[PDB]
């Protein structure tokens, strides 16, 4: 009316399924370290890029200043003969511009790494999501076999030696 193997044989399988569980648990926990670690490394890159923007912003304010400030000034060095003081100002500005190119290049390099690390994150999260169903099924099997042997009346000491 209610539709829903020897004890030693079911105990042998309880040993196996608990082992296969504990292996899979240790595996998922390794990935969850990587997930949490990489989540932190990505946030560090996401604010380091902000620090690159805010630096590159400040260098560009300097360029704006260099042009506004020199425009109203440099006409005096032209009419008063100093071609050399003009050329000093301009070289010093090309030296500024040249430096921005390094900072932009290093921002590009970081942006490349965070592109790679975002792909790693998603891959780690994907591999966790193909371990979850195995893990949960091994949990529930392990628990079914315990329930079976308990009902059959197996001593608590015997179940403990099978569990690890």
């Amino acid at each position: 009316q209610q539709d829903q193997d020897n004890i030693e044989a079911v105990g042998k399988k309880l040993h196996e399924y608990n082992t296969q569980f504990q292996e899979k648990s240790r595996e998922y926990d390794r990935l969850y370290e990587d997930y949490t670690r990489t989540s932190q490394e990505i946030q560090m890159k996401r604010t380091a890029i902000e620090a690159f923007n805010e630096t590159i912003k400040i260098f560009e304010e300097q360029c704006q200043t260099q042009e506004r400030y020199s425009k109203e000034y440099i006409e005096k060095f032209k009419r008063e003969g100093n071609e050399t003081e003009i050329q000093r100002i301009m070289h010093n500005y090309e030296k500024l511009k040249s430096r921005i190119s390094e900072i932009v290049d290093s921002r590009r390099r970081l942006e490349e790494d965070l592109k790679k690390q975002a792909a790693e994150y998603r891959e780690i999260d994907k591999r966790m999501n193909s371990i979850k169903p195995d893990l949960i099924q091994l949990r529930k099997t392990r628990d079914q076999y315990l329930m079976w042997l308990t009902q059959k009346g197996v001593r608590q000491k015997k179940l403990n030696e099978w569990l690890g």
Binding site: Y28, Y32, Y35, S39, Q40, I42, Q43, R46, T47, A48, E50, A51, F52, N53, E54, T55, I58, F59, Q62, C63, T65, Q66, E67, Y69, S70, Y73, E85, R88, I89, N92, Y93, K95, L96, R99, I103, A118, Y121, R122, E123, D125, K126, M128, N129, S130, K132, P133, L135, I136, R139
Partner: protein
């Protein structure tokens, strides 16, 4: 490498690039800069050096005006070595504090602005105004009241001499005084060559004042029991002032609640399987209606559903704290992928409308394995760039926006609307029939059973708005409950704002001392909160601003979880608020934070070196790093994080070492010749939160025992999580592990450290402490107790360290160790008189903890917020019920304890 090339942006647009030393302070770098700038164009147009401030992009990506030019470039620690000169003028008090807050709390303040969220902005506005106001108010008040704020009294729950002196004086006056002398009386006696003075325990920020005898103060109590003369300084009221300075109703929308499930984004699943979004509405833990599911759309990265999801609840029925919950699953024609929760009403009580993009949290496959996660946080995932997301849309209910009704209108539904024999049995000792029986007699529960409020809130049918109004009506006139009851009402089971407010109302009667015992649990409870502005946050802030110690430990409890995405935002905004009302204390916490950052750098070096090379060479190479200006000065002269009244003055590099654990803790020794040789352990690598809870609880037991006239000579030592797998332990000197003392031997060790008549004290100390830590470890279920993790003191006192596991994580028996029994009985085979006194201490101790059983159950129940591995469910809580036998009579419980005791004595032999 020593030197770094720094880019210098002059205000004329000119650009200089030259190398400076990492150690060089900014004052010095400005001189070098000016010296090179004179040989660059447009120099004549600059003002003098002191007209300008350096500016850099700091480590948290914010601009920082570097006002303190005595700081080293390596401590300023800019992002790139780029320094800009700008003008000094502008309100740079606001600027300074905003910068200093960003570095102090971890998260930079721009990250709050960036979110473009009103809730955040209004919290930041209201709480910062509140905090700034209280600090302004604090400053105007007297030196007495300021001393109460800054250095609140450390009290304990015949006559000897005392060494008194004044500040700035070599001579010191010693004289006899009694235990029961109030502090002012001693000052009158000290005036021998009163109310414009206060005593200080020199070498420490601990002061003696108020109408309390000398024995009640911890410093005196500490010195008396030892048998030592206290050392004090008299300080003038003038000197403390030097310290002190520097329009349509919701109940007419009878149409079932529904949502449009548009899209999934950034999903990562097995392509053979197919995706299902499961969903449901919740109030606290209970379901408001049955859970509905989407169609099984095939696994891609960007799945599109576009389904209405009709729920079996009308929009009028939705309670204030309604909580829509999602879970994304991957099915084969079951893997939980992710989950996300959403509040249906916003912080302004408005029913949310329109599209909403929930960035989801990943599911963790747990033992319960539920469909949805209604306990989890409301906050979106901070990782908006990489995390999975659900695009959904809450429909337009009406042309006008609709709010959840105001209290005047809630109470208006209250204004419309033999049996006791069954009710007493149910409350005075719930299932289907009983829940109704309480609800019918809900008026009688308020009248004769006010303590049963909690039971009554759960029987309330929160998925029908008529019920909800009636419960709230009763609640508004509900009599004030004791603290113990109010603690239960902070638990997640009671999510409604009106319950929260009542709970906090009843907690305002907490003294600062008592509030300190629960501060950790109260912090964790904030993880259950829905909205940023809440009553608990204002309460915690109120008490932090009124008391510097509470403020201190509030700071560290929150700071030490700033790495946890789920709480980073909520905790950041509170830390910002605290700091703004405690600018005085910011400066102390800055110094600690930097000391902590050097230790982390220092530990990481020791970790790496000890793998390669042996201990004595690694010990000396550690010292080399510590000798460096930046290191030595940052580690020197700071108030201890573990207790801000303690003073870590001069770091003793020779005594400084590290221990042989897996994570290799650093052992840092200090010295202060005003005091007297304090030390600390810097643990980095393991979680310390579980050790703290265990110590907090043993300390609570010690307090609980002491109140009933039982001092069991415990050592309630400090333990403080400061960060991500990082914290401190207070060193307790003249103490080693039993394992090391053993390499018979315990009693020999006590003999050598307590010669003559002092040995009888040391056995009494051992007996008393062995009792407390036997009962404590039994009650908390702390197994794995061996001589490697138990410690004796030279005084005789036993205490416990490295509480790795607890609450049985199978039942832990009561444990008597032969070696300890031998020492208890004074080295004899049979000393029944002594061993009976020891049995009585255990039984007395155990009796008193049962009397306060619900307190332990309530405090533990709130710690389920923290999500520690070994405290996650009702089974963990149930352990304490059974260990304290709270479902038995007092004598029945005590007879089982005796059977546990006696069988532990039998088990001791083998």
């Amino acid at each position: 490498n020593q030197s770094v090339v720094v880019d210098f942006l002059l205000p004329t647009g000119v650009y200089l690039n030259f190398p400076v030393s990492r150690n060089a302070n900014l004052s010095t770098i400005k001189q070098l800069l000016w010296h090179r700038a004179q040989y660059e164009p447009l120099f004549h147009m600059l003002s003098g050096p002191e007209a300008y401030v350096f500016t850099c992009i700091n480590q948290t990506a914010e601009q920082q005006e570097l006002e303190d030019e005595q700081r080293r470039l390596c401590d300023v620690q800019p992002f790139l070595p780029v320094l800009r000169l700008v003008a000094r003028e502008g309100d740079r008090v606001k600027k300074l504090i905003n910068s200093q807050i960003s570095l102090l709390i971890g998260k930079g303040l721009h990250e709050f602005d960036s979110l473009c969220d009103p809730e955040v902005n209004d919290f930041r506005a209201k709480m910062c105004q509140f905090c700034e106001e209280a600090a302004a108010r604090r400053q105007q008040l007297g030196w007495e009241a300021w001393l109460q704020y800054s250095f609140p009294l450390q009290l304990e729950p015949r006559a000897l001499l005392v060494n008194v002196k004044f500040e700035g004086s070599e001579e010191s006056f010693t004289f006899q005084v009694s235990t029961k002398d109030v502090p002012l009386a001693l000052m009158a006696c000290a005036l021998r060559k009163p109310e414009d003075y206060t005593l200080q325990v020199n070498g420490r920020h601990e002061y003696l004042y108020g109408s309390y005898p000398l024995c009640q103060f911890q410093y005196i109590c500490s010195c008396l029991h030892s048998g030592l003369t206290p050392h004090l300084t008299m300080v003038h009221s003038s000197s403390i002032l030097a310290m002190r300075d520097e329009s349509v109703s919701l109940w007419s929308l009878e149409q079932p609640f529904r949502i449009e499930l548009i899209q999934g984004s950034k999903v990562n699943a097995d392509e053979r399987m197919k995706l299902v979004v499961q969903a449901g509405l919740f109030h606290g833990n209970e379901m408001l209606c049955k859970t509905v599911s989407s169609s099984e759309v095939s696994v891609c990265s960007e799945p599109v559903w576009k389904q209405r999801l009709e729920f079996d609840i009308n929009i009028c029925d939705l309670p204030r704290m309604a909580r829509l919950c999602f879970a994304l699953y991957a099915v084969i024609e079951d893997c939980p992928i992710a989950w996300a929760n959403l509040m249906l009403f916003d912080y302004k009580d408005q029913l949310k409308t329109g599209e909403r993009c929930l960035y989801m949290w990943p599911s963790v496959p747990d033992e319960k394995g539920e469909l949805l996660n209604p306990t989890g946080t409301v906050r979106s995932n901070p990782n908006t760039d990489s995390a999975a997301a659900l695009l959904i849309c809450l429909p337009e209910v009406a042309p006008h926006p609709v709010y959840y009704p105001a209290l005047e209108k809630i109470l208006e539904l209250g204004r419309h609307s033999e049996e006791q024999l069954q009710l007493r049995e149910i409350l005075e000792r719930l299932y289907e029939h009983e829940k109704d029986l309480v609800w019918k007699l809900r008026h009688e529960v308020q009248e004769h059973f006010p303590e049963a409020l909690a039971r009554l809130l759960l029987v309330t049918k929160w998925n029908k708005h008529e019920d909800v109004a009636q419960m709230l009506y009763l609640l508004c006139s509900w009599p004030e409950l004791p603290v113990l009851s109010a603690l239960e009402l902070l638990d997640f089971s009671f999510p409604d704002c009106h319950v929260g407010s009542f709970a906090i109302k009843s907690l305002r009667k907490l003294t600062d001392d008592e509030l300190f015992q629960y501060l950790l649990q109260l912090v964790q409870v904030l993880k259950y909160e829905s909205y940023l502005d809440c009553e608990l946050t204002k309460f915690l802030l109120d008490r932090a601003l009124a008391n510097r110690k509470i403020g201190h430990f509030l700071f560290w409890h929150l700071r030490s979880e700033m790495h946890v995405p789920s709480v980073a935002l909520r905790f950041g905004l509170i830390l910002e608020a605290y700091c703004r009302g405690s600018t005085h204390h910011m400066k102390v916490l800055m110094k600690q934070g930097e000391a902590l950052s050097k230790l982390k750098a220092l530990n990481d070096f020791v970790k790496l070196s000890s793998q390669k090379t042996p201990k004595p060479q690694t010990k000396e190479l550690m010292h080399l790093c510590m000798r460096q200006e930046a290191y030595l000065e940052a580690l020197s002269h700071l108030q201890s994080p573990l207790d801000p009244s303690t003073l870590l003055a001069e770091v003793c590099v020779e005594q400084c070492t590290f221990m042989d654990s897996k994570m290799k803790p650093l052992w840092i020794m200090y010295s202060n010749e005003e005091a007297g040789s304090v030390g600390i352990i810097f643990k980095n690598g393991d979680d310390l939160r579980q050790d703290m809870l265990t110590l907090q609880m043993i300390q609570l037991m010690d307090v609980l025992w002491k109140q009933e006239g039982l001092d069991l000579r415990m050592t309630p030592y400090g333990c403080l999580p400061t960060g991500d797998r990082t914290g401190l332990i207070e060193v307790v000197l003249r103490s080693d592990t039993i394992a090391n003392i053993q390499l018979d031997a315990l009693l020999n060790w006590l003999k050598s450290k307590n010669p003559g008549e002092a040995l009888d004290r040391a056995i009494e100390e051992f007996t008393l402490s062995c009792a407390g830590y036997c009962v404590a470890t039994y009650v908390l279920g702390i197994g794995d107790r061996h001589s490697d993790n138990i410690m004796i003191r030279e005084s005789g006192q036993l205490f416990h360290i490295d509480f790795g596991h607890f609450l049985g994580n199978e039942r832990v028996p009561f444990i008597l160790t032969y070696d300890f029994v031998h020492v208890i009985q004074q080295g004899k085979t049979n000393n029944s008189e002594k061993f009976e006194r020891f049995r009585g201490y255990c039984e007395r101790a155990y009796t008193i903890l049962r009397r306060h059983g619900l307190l332990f159950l309530h405090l533990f129940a709130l710690m389920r917020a923290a999500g520690l591995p070994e405290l996650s469910c009702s089974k963990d809580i149930q352990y304490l019920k059974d260990s304290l036998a709270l479902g038995k009579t007092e004598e029945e419980a005590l007879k089982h304890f005796r059977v546990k005791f006696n069988e532990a004595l039998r088990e001791s032999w083998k």
